[model samples]
Target chain A: MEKRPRTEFSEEQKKALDLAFYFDRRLTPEWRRYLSQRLGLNEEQIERWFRRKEQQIGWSHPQFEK
Target chain B: MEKRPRTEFSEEQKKALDLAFYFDRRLTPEWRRYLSQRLGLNEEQIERWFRRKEQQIGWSHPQFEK
Candidate 1:
């Protein structure tokens, strides 16, 4: 498979996401809209960012062998 | 796009999810593993459940026309 950058978030964007995560991990539609608009990103990117953020903070659920 | 019953979570599963969401939407891997084992679900399912659950409680971000 070809290797490529999956995602790149700017420091400002990451900080914004961090602040938002600090408040709430669950994204409200209103918040999503606001974030998308503020960050110049789509809801999907926001979703991806949240997942990555979760993993970064050791908040992700465990994967199993079974 | 295609339409289908995306994911069906049991009431018990939902309740468990709610409790988890209430305390911490960002789940620890340990918690995820525990929940997965307890609910007999995989990590991916739990991840999907979280996204859906987030939407259900109006926690999702907004969509835009731009």
Candidate 2:
């Protein structure tokens, strides 16, 4: 199994992520690095946030589910 | 009737829209203003993009479609 880093988002961290996420879930490399540093979370954490959201949230764009 | 500015997205503008849309469809007022200026569009246009997207693309997050 792959080693996924474990850490929960703090309130502020969550806020930052929410702000960033409103812009794009499929992150560009620059954004991943930026959020990773900004939130003090690993890059995987940022990626996982979206991955987890997909299962829980289902779809962000129903028209373009592809 | 309202004075809604009329324009269309350039290729780069469309790219920017896709990038931002993936982040969050329900954008903040700040986000609305920012993207408007960044894309050389009016705030209504930004709002319209999200609105049109919802009607056309469906939910971006089916979990919190409320």
Candidate 3:
């Protein structure tokens, strides 16, 4: 299969994505909310970022297996 | 500020979801493609479904660290 295409992020979206990565790596809900507020993104957007990043990198949340 | 709302899945979507779950849990790429083909979903859609399901269940993939 061909490689999955990468979507280019605007500067603002990159900021949001980086913040989400930090929060997800730390597993800090507080930081997540902070990022959501700072990025002007709703909680759902933050959650979606986590989901997207996890899939792209093959990372799993600590709470569940496989 | 508020709870993240769940998107209601149509019956077809639900079936797709189930097949995705099976493929993810089993770690079978073949089955993943089978589900994608049977459901007429692109690989990207299957991948997105994996991401969504993982987020909902708080599961993670093995290759990436949290």
Candidate 4:
């Protein structure tokens, strides 16, 4: 299949977007929240943005009940 | 939006699949290639499978020229 195109964003949004991507790719929530706080973003905003970025990158952590 | 369901695979395929997922999430190419080699997979096969898995998970590193 052909590659999907990357979406461009404004500079301010890009910082948030990139942070979300990096956190999703690398860190757990505890680390992510710490990083978010250090970056001066609220935990909710960071969580939401991380989810959005994950969706944008085609990640789906499917829910399942045992 | 609701979460999607995770797909199941055969045992052998699952090994490759999980390796691909782990590599994509953590390692750079240098590390990935080493891991793939240690796993007895050809580099091309590993690369192809990684690309396919990325597509499966909705990742697209868009091609752009500066």
Q: DockQ each candidate and list the results.
A: 0.02, 0.12, 0.02, 0.04
Measured by TM-score, the strongest candidate is 2
Candidate 3, residue A56: how far the Cα is off, in Å: 3.2
lDDT of 2 by residue, B1-66 (tens): 111235554432433454455466435687766555534576777676666666654655332112
How does model 1 score on DockQ? 0.02
- Chain B alone, candidate 2, TM-score of 0.58
lDDT of 1 by residue, A1-66 (tens): 111124344432443354345254435676665555435566787677767766755866242211
Per-residue lDDT of candidate 4, residues B1-66 (tens digit): 111122222222223233234433424566445444333344555566556555654566331110
Task: Give the CA lDDT, 0 to 100, for residue A10 in model 3.
Answer: 27
Candidate 3: global Cα-lDDT? 0.42
Per-residue lDDT tens digits for candidate 1, residues B1-66, read 111123344442443354345244335576565555444466777777667765655756231211
Under CAPRI classification, how is model 4 graded? incorrect
* Clashing pairs for predicted structure model 3, backbone only: A60-B60
Candidate 3 Cα outliers beyond 4 Å, as residue runs: A1-11, A23-27, A60-66, B1-66
- Residue-level lDDT of model 2, residues A1-66, one tens digit each, is 111134554432443354445355435677776555434577777776656555555655232211
Runs off by more than 4 Å, candidate 1: A1-8, A22-26, A57-66, B1-66
Q: In candidate 2, which residue ranges exceed 4 Å CA deviation? A: A1-23, A28-66, B1-6, B22-26, B60-66
DockQ of 2: 0.12
Isolated chain A: TM-score per model? 0.59, 0.58, 0.47, 0.41
Best by DockQ: 2
